[PDB]
Amino acid sequence: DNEIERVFVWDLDETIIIFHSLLTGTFASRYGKDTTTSVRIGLMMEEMIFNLADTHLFFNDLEDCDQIHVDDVSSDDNGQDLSTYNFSADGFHSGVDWMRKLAFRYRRVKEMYNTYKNNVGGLIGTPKRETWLQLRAELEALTDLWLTHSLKALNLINSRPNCVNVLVTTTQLIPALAKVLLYGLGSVFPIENIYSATKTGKESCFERIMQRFGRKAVYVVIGDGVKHNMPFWRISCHADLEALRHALELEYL
Ligand SMILES: O=C(N/N=C/c1ccc(Sc2ncccn2)o1)c1cccc(F)c1
């Protein structure tokens, strides 16, 4: 109620965030869909994602310096008006003066996320929004609206004032933020609740979450595939999501 009574940890890899099943063509051999179209949308979607991260989120600057959380380098940020500040003409390339030149970028990344997480058309201006809307619709027709079905459970946890949902993924932070922004997961996934388990591992992020949210809350993990007293909700199947949704409506979860 006043605090987070329950906390949900999502591992949307192998389905949404990381969809390597598309590119390998195994997705169509598993589900009987067309094999070539599946790979086509995958390469097209990955193109728009990395275009959004390069053109807006300084991905080339932060590719090798990818953090685990967005608020990690807030210690070296001297808050200043940087509207005139142009990031291209600074000392940054490839630290008290250069680690000072890293946080304001991530504060800018947080600003772009928290401003266009529900107005992606104002960030990637149409026709780019019209291109990705057609792009998502074509992929959702193959997966039988998996992301749309998965968003029903995400918004359900989000609306609960005692519940919050966090994201732990193996991709780098900036690409994962680009995927969450584009896919429409901006509202249901607060930017401070996204963890890129790339440098450390999945377990160092779990303890990172429990350290922040405390042990007085019930931790549940909903994901796919593979301690710390956190029950796991393997949700690979499509009708599985219906049951998880079904359990949330009746407050069993
Ligand atoms: O829908 C998306 N991923 N779905 C993945 C997935 C794996 C298994 C199933 S269930 C199913 N699939 C096919 C046939 C029968 N049942 O869905 C998606 C990923 C990234 C972006 C985006 F916009 C959408």
Side-chain angles (χ1 to χ4, degrees), residues 6-65 67-77 79-92 95 97-100 102-103 105-128 131-137 139-167 169-198 200-201 203-206 208-214 217-253:
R6 336 202 71 220
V7 174
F8 290 86
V9 180
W10 287 89
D11 179 52
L12 292 165
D13 307 353
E14 257 292 82
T15 50
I16 305 188
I17 295 297
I18 282 192
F19 202 171
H20 193 82
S21 178
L22 265 192
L23 310 183
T24 47
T26 72
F27 171 71
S29 308
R30 288 192 57 151
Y31 299 96
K33 302 300 179 168
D34 178 70
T35 322
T36 315
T37 323
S38 316
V39 190
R40 280 199 63 190
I41 291 123
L43 294 137
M44 288 218 60
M45 205 166 49
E46 215 89 40
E47 208 292 288
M48 287 179 101
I49 291 178
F50 279 60
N51 205 256
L52 183 140
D54 289 342
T55 45
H56 296 295
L57 302 194
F58 313 111
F59 181 51
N60 261 295
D61 301 25
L62 319 180
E63 184 182 2
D64 276 42
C65 323
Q67 299 296 322
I68 168 174
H69 195 271
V70 49
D71 283 323
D72 271 329
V73 199
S74 177
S75 319
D76 302 271
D77 186 2
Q80 81 191 33
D81 190 355
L82 38 65
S83 71
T84 80
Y85 179 97
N86 160 263
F87 291 84
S88 57
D90 65 349
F92 203 100
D97 222 319
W98 175 92
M99 274 274 298
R100 204 194 93 260
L102 181 86
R105 273 168 172 80
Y106 271 104
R107 178 159 64 82
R108 190 62 139 192
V109 173
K110 180 194 280 163
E111 176 167 343
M112 307 300 285
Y113 184 105
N114 275 356
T115 314
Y116 300 108
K117 62 180 180 181
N118 220 72
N119 183 14
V120 198
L123 181 58
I124 46 146
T126 58
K128 248 147 182 291
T131 291
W132 185 89
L133 270 195
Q134 171 195 317
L135 206 59
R136 179 241 274 262
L139 176 55
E140 294 240 76
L142 297 189
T143 80
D144 292 340
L145 294 81
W146 170 270
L147 173 60
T148 297
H149 197 341
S150 80
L151 264 158
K152 290 173 186 161
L154 285 178
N155 285 286
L156 191 36
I157 295 154
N158 202 36
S159 55
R160 299 256 150 94
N162 56 80
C163 286
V164 81
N165 37 15
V166 301
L167 180 69
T169 190
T170 85
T171 38
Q172 314 182 251
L173 189 72
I174 300 296
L177 290 183
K179 301 213 182 184
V180 169
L181 269 175
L182 247 188
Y183 295 179
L185 304 178
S187 294
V188 312
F189 271 133
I191 188 182
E192 290 89 359
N193 298 344
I194 300 185
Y195 293 92
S196 176
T198 302
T200 78
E203 220 60 29
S204 171
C205 282
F206 289 168
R208 186 86 136 81
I209 291 177
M210 297 201 288
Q211 156 174 341
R212 158 147 167 268
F213 277 135
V218 194
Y219 296 92
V220 190
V221 185
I222 321 181
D224 193 352
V226 195
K227 39 168 151 285
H228 295 187
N229 297 74
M230 302 190 312
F232 190 79
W233 219 276
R234 172 230 67 178
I235 198 87
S236 74
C237 176
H238 210 71
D240 280 0
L241 265 165
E242 175 99 324
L244 171 66
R245 263 177 67 250
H246 201 340
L248 294 185
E249 317 203 82
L250 273 44
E251 313 217 44
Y252 300 146
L253 242 192

PDB file of all heavy atoms in Angstrom, residues 19-27 35 38-46:
ATOM      1  N   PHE A  19      15.233 -11.597 -28.408  1.00  0.00           N
ATOM      2  CA  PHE A  19      14.448 -12.546 -29.185  1.00  0.00           C
ATOM      3  C   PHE A  19      15.351 -13.225 -30.204  1.00  0.00           C
ATOM      4  O   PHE A  19      15.080 -13.186 -31.410  1.00  0.00           O
ATOM      5  CB  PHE A  19      13.272 -11.845 -29.870  1.00  0.00           C
ATOM      6  CG  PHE A  19      12.145 -12.770 -30.248  1.00  0.00           C
ATOM      7  CD1 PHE A  19      10.942 -12.260 -30.707  1.00  0.00           C
ATOM      8  CD2 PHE A  19      12.286 -14.145 -30.140  1.00  0.00           C
ATOM      9  CE1 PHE A  19       9.904 -13.104 -31.054  1.00  0.00           C
ATOM     10  CE2 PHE A  19      11.253 -14.992 -30.487  1.00  0.00           C
ATOM     11  CZ  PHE A  19      10.061 -14.471 -30.946  1.00  0.00           C
ATOM     12  N   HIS A  20      16.429 -13.847 -29.723  1.00  0.00           N
ATOM     13  CA  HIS A  20      17.355 -14.543 -30.609  1.00  0.00           C
ATOM     14  C   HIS A  20      16.704 -15.733 -31.301  1.00  0.00           C
ATOM     15  O   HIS A  20      17.254 -16.239 -32.285  1.00  0.00           O
ATOM     16  CB  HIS A  20      18.584 -14.998 -29.820  1.00  0.00           C
ATOM     17  CG  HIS A  20      19.726 -15.439 -30.681  1.00  0.00           C
ATOM     18  ND1 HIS A  20      20.612 -14.553 -31.256  1.00  0.00           N
ATOM     19  CD2 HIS A  20      20.131 -16.675 -31.059  1.00  0.00           C
ATOM     20  CE1 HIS A  20      21.511 -15.223 -31.954  1.00  0.00           C
ATOM     21  NE2 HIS A  20      21.242 -16.512 -31.850  1.00  0.00           N
ATOM     22  N   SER A  21      15.550 -16.189 -30.809  1.00  0.00           N
ATOM     23  CA  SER A  21      14.829 -17.264 -31.478  1.00  0.00           C
ATOM     24  C   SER A  21      14.334 -16.837 -32.854  1.00  0.00           C
ATOM     25  O   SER A  21      14.170 -17.682 -33.742  1.00  0.00           O
ATOM     26  CB  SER A  21      13.658 -17.725 -30.607  1.00  0.00           C
ATOM     27  OG  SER A  21      12.908 -18.739 -31.250  1.00  0.00           O
ATOM     28  N   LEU A  22      14.097 -15.537 -33.051  1.00  0.00           N
ATOM     29  CA  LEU A  22      13.681 -15.043 -34.360  1.00  0.00           C
ATOM     30  C   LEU A  22      14.795 -15.193 -35.387  1.00  0.00           C
ATOM     31  O   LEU A  22      14.585 -15.750 -36.471  1.00  0.00           O
ATOM     32  CB  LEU A  22      13.254 -13.577 -34.260  1.00  0.00           C
ATOM     33  CG  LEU A  22      11.776 -13.242 -34.062  1.00  0.00           C
ATOM     34  CD1 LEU A  22      11.537 -11.757 -34.287  1.00  0.00           C
ATOM     35  CD2 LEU A  22      10.908 -14.068 -34.991  1.00  0.00           C
ATOM     36  N   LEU A  23      15.991 -14.699 -35.059  1.00  0.00           N
ATOM     37  CA  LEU A  23      17.059 -14.607 -36.050  1.00  0.00           C
ATOM     38  C   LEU A  23      17.566 -15.985 -36.462  1.00  0.00           C
ATOM     39  O   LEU A  23      17.892 -16.205 -37.634  1.00  0.00           O
ATOM     40  CB  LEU A  23      18.200 -13.750 -35.503  1.00  0.00           C
ATOM     41  CG  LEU A  23      17.778 -12.399 -34.920  1.00  0.00           C
ATOM     42  CD1 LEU A  23      18.993 -11.601 -34.476  1.00  0.00           C
ATOM     43  CD2 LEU A  23      16.956 -11.612 -35.929  1.00  0.00           C
ATOM     44  N   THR A  24      17.638 -16.924 -35.518  1.00  0.00           N
ATOM     45  CA  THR A  24      18.102 -18.268 -35.843  1.00  0.00           C
ATOM     46  C   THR A  24      17.111 -19.047 -36.696  1.00  0.00           C
ATOM     47  O   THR A  24      17.484 -20.086 -37.251  1.00  0.00           O
ATOM     48  CB  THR A  24      18.392 -19.054 -34.563  1.00  0.00           C
ATOM     49  OG1 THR A  24      17.307 -18.891 -33.640  1.00  0.00           O
ATOM     50  CG2 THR A  24      19.680 -18.566 -33.920  1.00  0.00           C
ATOM     51  N   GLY A  25      15.873 -18.575 -36.820  1.00  0.00           N
ATOM     52  CA  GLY A  25      14.854 -19.300 -37.544  1.00  0.00           C
ATOM     53  C   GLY A  25      14.219 -20.438 -36.779  1.00  0.00           C
ATOM     54  O   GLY A  25      13.292 -21.071 -37.300  1.00  0.00           O
ATOM     55  N   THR A  26      14.687 -20.721 -35.560  1.00  0.00           N
ATOM     56  CA  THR A  26      14.086 -21.785 -34.764  1.00  0.00           C
ATOM     57  C   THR A  26      12.667 -21.434 -34.340  1.00  0.00           C
ATOM     58  O   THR A  26      11.848 -22.334 -34.125  1.00  0.00           O
ATOM     59  CB  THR A  26      14.944 -22.074 -33.532  1.00  0.00           C
ATOM     60  OG1 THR A  26      14.820 -20.994 -32.600  1.00  0.00           O
ATOM     61  CG2 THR A  26      16.407 -22.228 -33.925  1.00  0.00           C
ATOM     62  N   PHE A  27      12.361 -20.140 -34.217  1.00  0.00           N
ATOM     63  CA  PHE A  27      11.021 -19.724 -33.813  1.00  0.00           C
ATOM     64  C   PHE A  27       9.964 -20.238 -34.782  1.00  0.00           C
ATOM     65  O   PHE A  27       8.885 -20.674 -34.364  1.00  0.00           O
ATOM     66  CB  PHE A  27      10.958 -18.201 -33.711  1.00  0.00           C
ATOM     67  CG  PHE A  27       9.572 -17.664 -33.512  1.00  0.00           C
ATOM     68  CD1 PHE A  27       8.912 -17.844 -32.309  1.00  0.00           C
ATOM     69  CD2 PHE A  27       8.928 -16.982 -34.530  1.00  0.00           C
ATOM     70  CE1 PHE A  27       7.636 -17.352 -32.125  1.00  0.00           C
ATOM     71  CE2 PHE A  27       7.651 -16.487 -34.352  1.00  0.00           C
ATOM     72  CZ  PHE A  27       7.005 -16.673 -33.147  1.00  0.00           C
ATOM     73  N   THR A  35       9.554 -19.089 -42.002  1.00  0.00           N
ATOM     74  CA  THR A  35      10.904 -18.960 -41.469  1.00  0.00           C
ATOM     75  C   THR A  35      11.599 -17.698 -41.962  1.00  0.00           C
ATOM     76  O   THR A  35      12.346 -17.066 -41.208  1.00  0.00           O
ATOM     77  CB  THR A  35      11.726 -20.197 -41.826  1.00  0.00           C
ATOM     78  OG1 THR A  35      10.890 -21.360 -41.744  1.00  0.00           O
ATOM     79  CG2 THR A  35      12.881 -20.352 -40.857  1.00  0.00           C
ATOM     80  N   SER A  38      10.065 -14.250 -40.419  1.00  0.00           N
ATOM     81  CA  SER A  38      10.452 -14.077 -39.023  1.00  0.00           C
ATOM     82  C   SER A  38      11.833 -13.448 -38.907  1.00  0.00           C
ATOM     83  O   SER A  38      12.046 -12.539 -38.096  1.00  0.00           O
ATOM     84  CB  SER A  38      10.414 -15.423 -38.302  1.00  0.00           C
ATOM     85  OG  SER A  38       9.251 -16.152 -38.650  1.00  0.00           O
ATOM     86  N   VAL A  39      12.786 -13.917 -39.715  1.00  0.00           N
ATOM     87  CA  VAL A  39      14.126 -13.343 -39.678  1.00  0.00           C
ATOM     88  C   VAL A  39      14.123 -11.930 -40.245  1.00  0.00           C
ATOM     89  O   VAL A  39      14.883 -11.069 -39.784  1.00  0.00           O
ATOM     90  CB  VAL A  39      15.115 -14.252 -40.429  1.00  0.00           C
ATOM     91  CG1 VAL A  39      16.543 -13.793 -40.190  1.00  0.00           C
ATOM     92  CG2 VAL A  39      14.942 -15.694 -39.987  1.00  0.00           C
ATOM     93  N   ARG A  40      13.270 -11.660 -41.235  1.00  0.00           N
ATOM     94  CA  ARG A  40      13.234 -10.332 -41.843  1.00  0.00           C
ATOM     95  C   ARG A  40      12.811  -9.271 -40.834  1.00  0.00           C
ATOM     96  O   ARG A  40      13.453  -8.220 -40.719  1.00  0.00           O
ATOM     97  CB  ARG A  40      12.298 -10.332 -43.052  1.00  0.00           C
ATOM     98  CG  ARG A  40      12.912 -10.908 -44.319  1.00  0.00           C
ATOM     99  CD  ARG A  40      12.131 -10.474 -45.550  1.00  0.00           C
ATOM    100  NE  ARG A  40      12.160  -9.025 -45.729  1.00  0.00           N
ATOM    101  CZ  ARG A  40      11.411  -8.365 -46.606  1.00  0.00           C
ATOM    102  NH1 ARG A  40      10.570  -9.023 -47.392  1.00  0.00           N
ATOM    103  NH2 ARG A  40      11.503  -7.045 -46.699  1.00  0.00           N
ATOM    104  N   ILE A  41      11.729  -9.525 -40.094  1.00  0.00           N
ATOM    105  CA  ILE A  41      11.276  -8.559 -39.094  1.00  0.00           C
ATOM    106  C   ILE A  41      12.313  -8.412 -37.989  1.00  0.00           C
ATOM    107  O   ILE A  41      12.546  -7.308 -37.477  1.00  0.00           O
ATOM    108  CB  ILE A  41       9.901  -8.968 -38.534  1.00  0.00           C
ATOM    109  CG1 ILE A  41       8.816  -8.820 -39.602  1.00  0.00           C
ATOM    110  CG2 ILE A  41       9.543  -8.135 -37.310  1.00  0.00           C
ATOM    111  CD1 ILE A  41       8.054 -10.094 -39.876  1.00  0.00           C
ATOM    112  N   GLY A  42      12.961  -9.516 -37.611  1.00  0.00           N
ATOM    113  CA  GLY A  42      13.969  -9.450 -36.564  1.00  0.00           C
ATOM    114  C   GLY A  42      15.114  -8.520 -36.913  1.00  0.00           C
ATOM    115  O   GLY A  42      15.523  -7.685 -36.104  1.00  0.00           O
ATOM    116  N   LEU A  43      15.645  -8.648 -38.132  1.00  0.00           N
ATOM    117  CA  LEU A  43      16.717  -7.755 -38.558  1.00  0.00           C
ATOM    118  C   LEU A  43      16.218  -6.330 -38.753  1.00  0.00           C
ATOM    119  O   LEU A  43      16.959  -5.375 -38.493  1.00  0.00           O
ATOM    120  CB  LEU A  43      17.361  -8.274 -39.845  1.00  0.00           C
ATOM    121  CG  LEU A  43      18.118  -9.601 -39.760  1.00  0.00           C
ATOM    122  CD1 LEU A  43      17.794 -10.476 -40.959  1.00  0.00           C
ATOM    123  CD2 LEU A  43      19.615  -9.364 -39.657  1.00  0.00           C
ATOM    124  N   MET A  44      14.973  -6.164 -39.207  1.00  0.00           N
ATOM    125  CA  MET A  44      14.416  -4.823 -39.362  1.00  0.00           C
ATOM    126  C   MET A  44      14.171  -4.167 -38.010  1.00  0.00           C
ATOM    127  O   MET A  44      14.458  -2.978 -37.830  1.00  0.00           O
ATOM    128  CB  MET A  44      13.118  -4.880 -40.170  1.00  0.00           C
ATOM    129  CG  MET A  44      13.310  -5.183 -41.645  1.00  0.00           C
ATOM    130  SD  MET A  44      12.172  -4.246 -42.680  1.00  0.00           S
ATOM    131  CE  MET A  44      12.647  -2.569 -42.263  1.00  0.00           C
ATOM    132  N   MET A  45      13.638  -4.924 -37.049  1.00  0.00           N
ATOM    133  CA  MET A  45      13.378  -4.366 -35.728  1.00  0.00           C
ATOM    134  C   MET A  45      14.677  -4.015 -35.015  1.00  0.00           C
ATOM    135  O   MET A  45      14.778  -2.957 -34.382  1.00  0.00           O
ATOM    136  CB  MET A  45      12.556  -5.351 -34.901  1.00  0.00           C
ATOM    137  CG  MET A  45      11.730  -4.715 -33.801  1.00  0.00           C
ATOM    138  SD  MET A  45      10.502  -5.870 -33.169  1.00  0.00           S
ATOM    139  CE  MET A  45      11.528  -7.313 -32.892  1.00  0.00           C
ATOM    140  N   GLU A  46      15.682  -4.889 -35.109  1.00  0.00           N
ATOM    141  CA  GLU A  46      16.982  -4.593 -34.516  1.00  0.00           C
ATOM    142  C   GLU A  46      17.613  -3.357 -35.143  1.00  0.00           C
ATOM    143  O   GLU A  46      18.382  -2.649 -34.483  1.00  0.00           O
ATOM    144  CB  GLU A  46      17.914  -5.797 -34.666  1.00  0.00           C
ATOM    145  CG  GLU A  46      18.868  -6.000 -33.498  1.00  0.00           C
ATOM    146  CD  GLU A  46      18.282  -6.876 -32.405  1.00  0.00           C
ATOM    147  OE1 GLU A  46      17.603  -7.870 -32.735  1.00  0.00           O
ATOM    148  OE2 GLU A  46      18.503  -6.570 -31.213  1.00  0.00           O
TER     149      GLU A  46
END
